[PDB]
């Protein structure tokens, strides 16, 4: 809401301006890596138990 | 006051007001304190007749 003043001059303000602002947000995406070794797979699975 | 345009309907709201200087004499002082901007650039212009 644009705030207004009634100015002392009788000259016309001609229009007030009241509008809506729309903004597109943005997007980013994060990253990580977890890597496991060869023999660690079979030990969690049970192939080497 | 209602005004009709092709773009839209205008409403203009007015309020008449009046002023009386009550004090016989000086009731108000302006005090000039600081300076911001030499809006006139102090350059060189020749006035051409």
Structural class by SSE content of chain A: mainly alpha
Biggest sheet of chain A: strands, sense, closure? none
Query: In whole angstroms, how far apart are the ends of chain A?
Result: 71 Å
Portion of residues in beta strands of chain A equals under 5%
Query: What is the overall number of helices of chain A?
Result: 1
State the order of secondary-structure elements of chain A, H for helix, E for strand: H
Which percent bin holds the helix content of chain A?
A: 10-25%
What does the overall shape of chain A look like?
rod-shaped
How many β-strands of chain A, per DSSP?
0
Protein name (chain B): Major capsid protein
Organism (chain B): Human herpesvirus 1
Structural topology:
This is part of a larger assembly, with two copies of chain A (49 residues).
Chain A: H1 38-45
Brief write-up:
The structure is cut from a larger assembly and holds two copies of chain A (49 residues). With 49 residues, chain A is mostly helical.
Entry keywords:
part of a larger assembly; 2 chains; 49 residues; mainly alpha; 16% helix; Major capsid protein (chain A); viral protein; tegument
Would you mind describing this structure in some detail?
Chain A: This is Major capsid protein. The structure is cut from a larger assembly and holds 2 copies of chain A (49 residues). Chain A has one helix spanning 38-45. The first copy, chain A, is mainly alpha-helical. The radius of gyration of chain A is 33 Å and the shape is rod-shaped. Chain A is built from 1 helix and no strands.
């Amino acid at each position: 809401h644009q705030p207004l003043i009634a100015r002392d001059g009788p000259h016309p303000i001609e229009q007030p301006t009241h509008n809506y602002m729309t903004k597109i947000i943005d997007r980013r995406a994060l990253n990580a890596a977890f890597s496991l070794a060869t023999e660690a797979i079979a030990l969690l699975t049970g192939e080497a138990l | 006051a209602r005004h009709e345009t092709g773009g839209g309907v205008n409403f203009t709201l007015t309020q008449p007001r009046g002023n009386v200087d009550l004090g016989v004499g000086y009731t108000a002082v302006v005090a000039t304190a600081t300076v911001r901007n030499p809006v006139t650039d102090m350059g060189n212009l020749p006035q051409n007749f």
